[PDB]
Enzyme design. Structure first.
Site, PDB file in Angstrom:
ATOM      1  N   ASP A  21       0.853  -1.224   0.000  1.00  0.00           N
ATOM      2  CA  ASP A  21       0.000   0.000   0.000  1.00  0.00           C
ATOM      3  C   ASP A  21       0.874   1.255   0.000  1.00  0.00           C
ATOM      4  O   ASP A  21       0.469   2.277  -0.502  1.00  0.00           O
ATOM      5  CB  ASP A  21      -0.884   0.027   1.255  1.00  0.00           C
ATOM      6  CG  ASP A  21      -1.718  -1.267   1.367  1.00  0.00           C
ATOM      7  OD1 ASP A  21      -2.021  -1.863   0.342  1.00  0.00           O
ATOM      8  OD2 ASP A  21      -2.048  -1.634   2.481  1.00  0.00           O
ATOM      9  N   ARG A  35      -0.719   5.362   1.497  1.00  0.00           N
ATOM     10  CA  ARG A  35      -0.876   3.978   2.050  1.00  0.00           C
ATOM     11  C   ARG A  35      -2.355   3.560   2.058  1.00  0.00           C
ATOM     12  O   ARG A  35      -2.670   2.421   1.783  1.00  0.00           O
ATOM     13  CB  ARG A  35      -0.318   3.912   3.483  1.00  0.00           C
ATOM     14  CG  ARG A  35      -0.849   5.086   4.308  1.00  0.00           C
ATOM     15  CD  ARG A  35      -0.718   4.791   5.807  1.00  0.00           C
ATOM     16  NE  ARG A  35       0.714   4.596   6.173  1.00  0.00           N
ATOM     17  CZ  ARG A  35       1.093   4.732   7.418  1.00  0.00           C
ATOM     18  NH1 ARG A  35       0.844   5.844   8.061  1.00  0.00           N
ATOM     19  NH2 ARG A  35       1.732   3.761   8.016  1.00  0.00           N
ATOM     20  N   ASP A  40       2.149  -3.905   5.613  1.00  0.00           N
ATOM     21  CA  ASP A  40       2.501  -4.489   6.945  1.00  0.00           C
ATOM     22  C   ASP A  40       3.925  -5.071   6.906  1.00  0.00           C
ATOM     23  O   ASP A  40       4.147  -6.226   7.233  1.00  0.00           O
ATOM     24  CB  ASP A  40       1.482  -5.587   7.290  1.00  0.00           C
ATOM     25  CG  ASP A  40       1.586  -5.959   8.773  1.00  0.00           C
ATOM     26  OD1 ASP A  40       1.320  -5.103   9.605  1.00  0.00           O
ATOM     27  OD2 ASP A  40       1.926  -7.096   9.054  1.00  0.00           O
ATOM     28  N   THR A  41       4.893  -4.277   6.509  1.00  0.00           N
ATOM     29  CA  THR A  41       6.300  -4.763   6.445  1.00  0.00           C
ATOM     30  C   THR A  41       6.928  -4.749   7.854  1.00  0.00           C
ATOM     31  O   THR A  41       7.414  -5.772   8.303  1.00  0.00           O
ATOM     32  CB  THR A  41       7.120  -3.872   5.497  1.00  0.00           C
ATOM     33  OG1 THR A  41       6.262  -3.245   4.550  1.00  0.00           O
ATOM     34  CG2 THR A  41       8.144  -4.729   4.763  1.00  0.00           C
ATOM     35  N   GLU A  43       7.286  -5.365  11.399  1.00  0.00           N
ATOM     36  CA  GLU A  43       6.566  -6.256  12.359  1.00  0.00           C
ATOM     37  C   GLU A  43       7.407  -6.448  13.629  1.00  0.00           C
ATOM     38  O   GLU A  43       8.171  -7.390  13.740  1.00  0.00           O
ATOM     39  CB  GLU A  43       6.304  -7.613  11.694  1.00  0.00           C
ATOM     40  CG  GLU A  43       5.187  -7.473  10.653  1.00  0.00           C
ATOM     41  CD  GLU A  43       3.841  -7.271  11.360  1.00  0.00           C
ATOM     42  OE1 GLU A  43       3.215  -8.263  11.697  1.00  0.00           O
ATOM     43  OE2 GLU A  43       3.458  -6.125  11.548  1.00  0.00           O
ATOM     44  N   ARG A  87      -1.407  11.833   6.473  1.00  0.00           N
ATOM     45  CA  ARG A  87      -0.612  11.474   5.262  1.00  0.00           C
ATOM     46  C   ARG A  87      -1.564  11.362   4.064  1.00  0.00           C
ATOM     47  O   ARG A  87      -2.767  11.474   4.213  1.00  0.00           O
ATOM     48  CB  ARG A  87       0.088  10.132   5.502  1.00  0.00           C
ATOM     49  CG  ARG A  87       1.417  10.100   4.744  1.00  0.00           C
ATOM     50  CD  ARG A  87       2.146   8.787   5.033  1.00  0.00           C
ATOM     51  NE  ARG A  87       1.503   7.660   4.293  1.00  0.00           N
ATOM     52  CZ  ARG A  87       2.183   6.566   4.063  1.00  0.00           C
ATOM     53  NH1 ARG A  87       2.955   6.058   4.992  1.00  0.00           N
ATOM     54  NH2 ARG A  87       2.095   5.984   2.898  1.00  0.00           N
TER      55      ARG A  87
END
Length: 103
Positions: A21, A35, A40-41, A43, A87
């Site tokens: 995203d 986004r 979800d990179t 973690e 954002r």
């Protein structure tokens, strides 16, 4: 809650696809990042050194629908997905549209 989801459309310029995203492009001549739902990179940051990755598995292919897309149509739904920092939460629609090229 009101039904205000649809996403508009406006050409942009490939700057640098960060993640699924997350994507860097200029929708109105302004280099930013969009986004919408946010990938979800990241973690949990561990104390020991891990490894830097350009993009996850399926999100890696989503990174391509932005690094070589010439015609773009950054679709920002009515009322951008702002929050605290505000954002440019939205999706890019170039070469394939909706970045869903993986079929």
């Amino acid at each position: 809650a009101t039904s205000t989801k649809k996403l508009h459309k406006e050409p942009a310029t490939l700057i640098k696809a960060i993640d699924g995203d997350t994507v860097k492009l200029m929708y109105k001549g302004q280099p930013m990042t969009f986004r919408l739902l946010l990938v979800d990179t990241p973690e949990t940051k561990h104390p020991k050194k891990g490894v830097e990755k350009y993009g996850p598995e399926a999100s890696a292919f989503t990174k391509k629908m932005l690094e070589n897309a010439k015609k773009i149509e950054v679709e920002f739904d009515k009322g951008q997905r702002t929050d605290k920092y505000g954002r440019v939460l939205a999706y890019i629609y170039a070469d394939g549209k909706m970045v869903n090229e993986a079929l």
